[PDB]
Amino acid sequence: EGSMYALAFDLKIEILKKEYGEPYNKAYDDLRQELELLGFEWTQGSVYVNYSKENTLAQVYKAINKLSQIEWFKKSVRDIRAFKVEDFSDFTEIVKSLEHHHH
Amino acid sequence: YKLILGETTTEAVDAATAEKVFKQYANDNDGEWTYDDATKTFTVTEGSMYALAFDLKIEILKKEYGEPYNKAYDDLRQELELLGFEWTQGSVYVNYSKENTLAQVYKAINKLSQIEWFKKSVRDIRAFKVEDFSDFTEIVKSL
Protein backbone atom coordinates (compact mmCIF):
# COMPACT_ATOMS: atom_id res chain seq x y z
CA GLU A 1 0.00 0.00 0.00
CA GLY A 2 0.98 3.64 0.49
CA SER A 3 4.16 5.17 1.89
CA MET A 4 5.19 6.63 5.28
CA TYR A 5 5.47 10.22 6.46
CA ALA A 6 7.76 12.34 8.60
CA LEU A 7 6.74 15.50 10.42
CA ALA A 8 9.34 18.09 11.46
CA PHE A 9 9.09 21.51 13.08
CA ASP A 10 10.80 24.33 14.96
CA LEU A 11 9.56 26.90 17.46
CA LYS A 12 10.81 30.35 18.37
CA ILE A 13 11.53 29.99 22.09
CA GLU A 14 11.38 33.76 22.58
CA ILE A 15 7.72 33.87 21.67
CA LEU A 16 7.03 30.30 22.75
CA LYS A 17 7.69 31.48 26.30
CA LYS A 18 5.09 34.25 26.13
CA GLU A 19 2.30 32.32 24.38
CA TYR A 20 2.77 29.38 26.75
CA GLY A 21 4.75 30.42 29.82
CA GLU A 22 7.48 28.61 31.73
CA PRO A 23 8.24 25.85 32.16
CA TYR A 24 7.93 26.06 28.36
CA ASN A 25 9.46 22.61 27.82
CA LYS A 26 6.10 21.20 28.92
CA ALA A 27 4.79 22.43 25.57
CA TYR A 28 6.73 19.73 23.79
CA ASP A 29 5.14 17.12 26.04
CA ASP A 30 1.75 18.37 24.90
CA LEU A 31 2.41 18.19 21.14
CA ARG A 32 3.92 14.77 21.73
CA GLN A 33 0.73 13.15 22.99
CA GLU A 34 -1.29 14.88 20.30
CA LEU A 35 1.07 13.65 17.57
CA GLU A 36 1.44 10.22 19.17
CA LEU A 37 -2.33 9.79 18.93
CA LEU A 38 -2.32 10.49 15.19
CA GLY A 39 0.21 7.69 14.77
CA PHE A 40 3.29 9.91 14.65
CA GLU A 41 6.13 8.65 16.86
CA TRP A 42 8.74 10.84 18.56
CA THR A 43 12.09 10.30 16.87
CA GLN A 44 14.19 13.23 18.09
CA GLY A 45 13.51 16.79 19.21
CA SER A 46 10.66 18.02 17.01
CA VAL A 47 10.88 15.30 14.36
CA TYR A 48 8.06 12.78 14.26
CA VAL A 49 7.68 9.80 11.94
CA ASN A 50 4.43 7.87 11.43
CA TYR A 51 5.72 4.49 10.28
CA SER A 52 2.32 3.31 9.08
CA LYS A 53 1.84 2.23 5.47
CA GLU A 54 -1.95 2.70 5.16
CA ASN A 55 -3.74 6.04 4.76
CA THR A 56 -0.78 7.90 6.24
CA LEU A 57 -1.11 11.03 4.08
CA ALA A 58 -4.44 11.39 5.84
CA GLN A 59 -2.68 11.42 9.20
CA VAL A 60 -0.47 14.36 8.23
CA TYR A 61 -3.48 16.44 7.14
CA LYS A 62 -5.08 15.47 10.48
CA ALA A 63 -1.94 16.41 12.41
CA ILE A 64 -1.61 19.72 10.65
CA ASN A 65 -5.26 20.42 11.41
CA LYS A 66 -4.88 19.71 15.14
CA LEU A 67 -1.74 21.85 15.40
CA SER A 68 -3.63 24.64 13.65
CA GLN A 69 -6.10 24.58 16.56
CA ILE A 70 -3.39 25.14 19.18
CA GLU A 71 -2.95 28.92 19.47
CA TRP A 72 0.42 28.87 21.25
CA PHE A 73 1.73 26.68 18.45
CA LYS A 74 0.44 28.87 15.59
CA LYS A 75 2.07 31.89 17.18
CA SER A 76 5.47 30.35 17.99
CA VAL A 77 6.06 28.02 15.06
CA ARG A 78 9.00 29.06 12.88
CA ASP A 79 8.62 26.12 10.51
CA ILE A 80 6.63 22.87 10.14
CA ARG A 81 7.31 20.33 7.33
CA ALA A 82 6.05 16.96 6.19
CA PHE A 83 8.32 14.52 4.35
CA LYS A 84 7.05 11.62 2.30
CA VAL A 85 9.37 8.83 3.41
CA GLU A 86 9.67 6.00 0.88
CA ASP A 87 11.98 3.94 3.09
CA PHE A 88 14.40 4.27 6.01
CA SER A 89 17.35 2.48 7.63
CA ASP A 90 18.86 2.66 11.12
CA PHE A 91 22.02 1.06 9.77
CA THR A 92 23.91 3.96 11.32
CA GLU A 93 22.96 3.81 15.03
CA ILE A 94 24.95 0.59 15.60
CA VAL A 95 27.41 0.78 12.66
CA LYS A 96 28.19 4.35 13.67
CA SER A 97 28.99 3.36 17.26
CA LEU A 98 30.60 -0.11 16.93
CA GLU A 99 32.56 0.17 13.66
CA HIS A 100 36.23 0.74 14.43
CA HIS A 101 39.07 1.75 12.12
CA HIS A 102 42.65 0.49 12.41
CA HIS A 103 44.96 2.81 10.48
CA TYR B 1 13.63 -12.87 -13.40
CA LYS B 2 11.13 -10.06 -12.83
CA LEU B 3 12.28 -6.46 -13.34
CA ILE B 4 10.40 -3.88 -11.28
CA LEU B 5 11.01 -0.33 -12.54
CA GLY B 6 6.36 -1.11 -14.81
CA GLU B 7 7.67 -4.68 -15.06
CA THR B 8 9.42 -7.10 -17.44
CA THR B 9 10.97 -10.58 -17.38
CA THR B 10 13.83 -12.62 -18.86
CA GLU B 11 15.02 -16.23 -19.17
CA ALA B 12 18.69 -15.56 -18.48
CA VAL B 13 21.08 -18.34 -17.45
CA ASP B 14 21.34 -17.02 -13.89
CA ALA B 15 20.71 -13.99 -11.67
CA ALA B 16 24.21 -12.68 -12.44
CA THR B 17 23.89 -12.85 -16.23
CA ALA B 18 20.28 -11.67 -15.99
CA GLU B 19 21.31 -8.26 -14.64
CA LYS B 20 23.31 -7.34 -17.75
CA VAL B 21 20.08 -7.50 -19.75
CA PHE B 22 17.78 -5.50 -17.47
CA LYS B 23 20.74 -3.12 -17.07
CA GLN B 24 21.06 -2.05 -20.70
CA TYR B 25 17.27 -2.25 -20.87
CA ALA B 26 16.24 0.45 -18.36
CA ASN B 27 19.34 2.39 -19.45
CA ASP B 28 17.66 2.79 -22.84
CA ASN B 29 14.20 3.99 -21.79
CA ASP B 30 18.69 4.73 -14.42
CA GLY B 31 19.13 4.49 -10.64
CA GLU B 32 19.79 2.38 -7.55
CA TRP B 33 19.46 -1.38 -8.10
CA THR B 34 18.41 -4.01 -5.56
CA TYR B 35 18.00 -7.77 -5.99
CA ASP B 36 16.00 -10.52 -4.32
CA ASP B 37 17.25 -13.89 -5.60
CA ALA B 38 14.94 -15.94 -3.39
CA THR B 39 12.24 -14.61 -5.74
CA LYS B 40 14.20 -13.74 -8.90
CA THR B 41 13.02 -10.14 -8.72
CA PHE B 42 15.34 -7.30 -9.75
CA THR B 43 14.14 -3.80 -8.85
CA VAL B 44 15.45 -0.37 -9.75
CA THR B 45 14.59 3.15 -8.64
CA GLU B 46 16.07 6.22 -10.29
CA GLY B 47 17.56 9.12 -8.36
CA SER B 48 16.09 9.76 -4.92
CA MET B 49 16.51 12.26 -2.07
CA TYR B 50 17.75 11.29 1.38
CA ALA B 51 17.28 12.77 4.81
CA LEU B 52 19.83 12.27 7.56
CA ALA B 53 18.73 12.73 11.15
CA PHE B 54 20.76 12.33 14.31
CA ASP B 55 20.57 12.78 18.07
CA LEU B 56 23.33 13.03 20.70
CA LYS B 57 23.22 12.54 24.46
CA ILE B 58 24.10 16.02 25.76
CA GLU B 59 25.27 14.38 28.96
CA ILE B 60 28.20 12.72 27.14
CA LEU B 61 29.04 15.46 24.60
CA LYS B 62 30.13 17.73 27.46
CA LYS B 63 32.72 15.08 28.34
CA GLU B 64 33.83 13.81 24.91
CA TYR B 65 33.70 17.07 22.99
CA GLY B 66 33.72 19.63 25.78
CA GLU B 67 31.77 22.66 26.99
CA PRO B 68 30.50 24.76 25.34
CA TYR B 69 29.18 22.12 22.94
CA ASN B 70 27.23 24.09 20.32
CA LYS B 71 30.40 24.26 18.23
CA ALA B 72 30.16 20.46 17.85
CA TYR B 73 26.89 20.91 15.97
CA ASP B 74 28.58 23.43 13.67
CA ASP B 75 31.44 20.98 13.10
CA LEU B 76 28.80 18.47 12.16
CA ARG B 77 26.85 20.80 9.87
CA GLN B 78 30.05 21.51 7.91
CA GLU B 79 31.09 17.90 7.36
CA LEU B 80 27.52 17.13 6.35
CA GLU B 81 27.40 20.23 4.10
CA LEU B 82 30.54 19.18 2.26
CA LEU B 83 28.79 15.87 1.50
CA GLY B 84 25.74 17.50 -0.01
CA PHE B 85 23.37 17.31 2.94
CA GLU B 86 22.05 20.70 4.02
CA TRP B 87 20.71 21.67 7.43
CA THR B 88 16.95 21.98 7.61
CA GLN B 89 14.89 23.33 10.50
CA GLY B 90 15.97 21.15 13.42
CA SER B 91 18.73 18.50 13.50
CA VAL B 92 17.51 17.01 10.18
CA TYR B 93 19.73 17.15 7.11
CA VAL B 94 18.41 16.73 3.59
CA ASN B 95 20.48 15.91 0.54
CA TYR B 96 18.39 17.15 -2.38
CA SER B 97 20.85 15.85 -5.06
CA LYS B 98 18.84 12.95 -6.55
CA GLU B 99 21.87 11.16 -8.09
CA ASN B 100 24.19 8.71 -6.31
CA THR B 101 22.88 10.34 -3.14
CA LEU B 102 22.83 6.97 -1.40
CA ALA B 103 26.60 6.85 -1.82
CA GLN B 104 26.85 10.25 -0.17
CA VAL B 105 24.75 8.91 2.67
CA TYR B 106 27.23 6.10 3.13
CA LYS B 107 30.07 8.59 2.72
CA ALA B 108 28.55 10.55 5.60
CA ILE B 109 28.03 7.55 7.85
CA ASN B 110 31.59 6.54 7.25
CA LYS B 111 32.93 9.95 8.24
CA LEU B 112 30.77 10.11 11.36
CA SER B 113 31.89 6.60 12.23
CA GLN B 114 35.48 7.86 12.35
CA ILE B 115 34.84 10.86 14.62
CA GLU B 116 35.48 9.59 18.17
CA TRP B 117 33.32 11.98 20.22
CA PHE B 118 30.42 11.55 17.84
CA LYS B 119 30.69 7.76 18.08
CA LYS B 120 30.69 8.23 21.83
CA SER B 121 27.75 10.65 21.90
CA VAL B 122 25.17 9.47 19.36
CA ARG B 123 21.88 8.26 20.80
CA ASP B 124 20.44 7.53 17.37
CA ILE B 125 21.20 8.18 13.72
CA ARG B 126 19.24 7.30 10.57
CA ALA B 127 18.72 8.06 6.91
CA PHE B 128 15.43 8.38 5.03
CA LYS B 129 14.60 7.99 1.39
CA VAL B 130 12.62 11.16 0.68
CA GLU B 131 10.31 11.23 -2.31
CA ASP B 132 8.53 14.48 -1.62
CA PHE B 133 8.27 17.07 1.14
CA SER B 134 5.73 19.81 1.72
CA ASP B 135 6.04 22.94 3.83
CA PHE B 136 2.92 23.57 5.98
CA THR B 137 4.20 26.56 7.91
CA GLU B 138 2.11 29.27 6.23
CA ILE B 139 -1.09 27.23 6.24
CA VAL B 140 -0.76 26.21 9.89
CA LYS B 141 -0.74 29.93 10.68
CA SER B 142 -3.84 31.06 8.73
CA LEU B 143 -7.00 31.77 10.77
| DSSP assignment string, B19-79 | HHHHHHHHHT--EEEEEEGGGTEEEEEE--EEEEEEEE-HHHHHHHT-SS-HHHHHHHHHH
- Residue B137 and residue A77: Cβ atoms within 8 Å? yes
CATH number for the domain harbouring residue A55: 3.30.70.240
Could you tell me if B3 and B54 lie in one domain?
no
Method: X-ray
What DSSP element (H or E) covers B113?
A: helix B101-113
Could you tell me if B71 and B96 lie in one domain?
yes
A1 to each of A4, A5, A14, A56, how far by Cα in Å? Answer: 10, 13, 42, 10
B64 to each of B54, B58, B79, B112, B135, how far by Cα in Å? Answer: 17, 10, 18, 14, 36
CA gap B68, B61 in Å, rounded = 9
Counting beta carbons within 10 angstroms of the beta carbon of residue B46, is it exposed (0 to 12), middle (13 to 18) or buried (19 or more)?
A: exposed
DSSP bridge partners of B2: B41
Structural domain span for residue A8: 1-85
Question: Could you tell me which of A43, A78, A49 has the C-alpha nearest to residue A63?
Answer: A49
Of B91, B113, B129, nearest to A85 by CB-CB distance is B129
Could you tell me if B56 and B10 lie in one domain?
no
Residue A16 located in a structural domain: yes
Identity of the amino acid at B21: V
Per-residue b or e along B24-40, where b marks 16 or more CB atoms closer than 10 Å to that residue's CB: eebeeeeebeebeeeeb
Could you tell me if B2 and B22 lie in one domain?
yes
User: What is the tally of structural domains in chain A?
Assistant: 1
Of A77, A85, A93, nearest to B130 by CB-CB distance is A85
- Residue A84 and residue B48: Cβ atoms within 8 Å? no
Could you tell me if B76 and B128 lie in one domain?
yes
Identity of the amino acid at A94: I
B54 lies within 8 A of chain A by CB: yes
- Residue B134 and residue A89: Cβ atoms within 8 Å? no
Q: Are B101 and B50 in contact (CB under 8 A)?
A: yes
